Structure 1
Amino acid sequence: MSSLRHAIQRRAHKERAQPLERQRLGILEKKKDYRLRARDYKKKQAVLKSLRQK
């Protein structure tokens, strides 16, 4: 359950960053930023597919 877990069970797992030898390329895209990118592209392609049908 939720009372059968310690605080070390609850402890957050940190996110790694972009390596410092590669920081000029921008931020390291993880699942959240990838979800934002994919949502924007699927939305724009949905509008373009409806415009091509019309």
Structure 2
Amino acid sequence: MAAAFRKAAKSRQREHRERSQPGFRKHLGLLEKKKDYKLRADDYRKKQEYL
């Protein structure tokens, strides 16, 4: 009954929420997370490989 144990645990579907930029640094821009930096990181790697 391994799946039965899994179904009970996943009864609650509230997922962890994201934190925002602090107010006193609002004019700088959005606080980047791993999902955002990965877009900027893969962009650099493609150009350097091409050169």
Unpaired segments ≥5 residues, structure 2 = none
Match of 1:45 in 2: 48
Instruction: Give the TM-score taking structure 1 as reference length.
Output: 0.73
Match of 2:7 in 1: 3
Q: Which amino acid letter does the alignment assign opposite residue 7 of structure 2?
A: S
What is the aligned length?
Answer: 46
Q: What's the C-alpha RMSD, in Å, of the aligned pairs?
A: 1.3
Question: Percent sequence identity over matched residues?
Answer: 54
Moved over 2 A (4+): none
Instruction: Give the TM-score taking structure 2 as reference length.
Output: 0.77
Unpaired segments ≥5 residues, structure 1 = 49-54
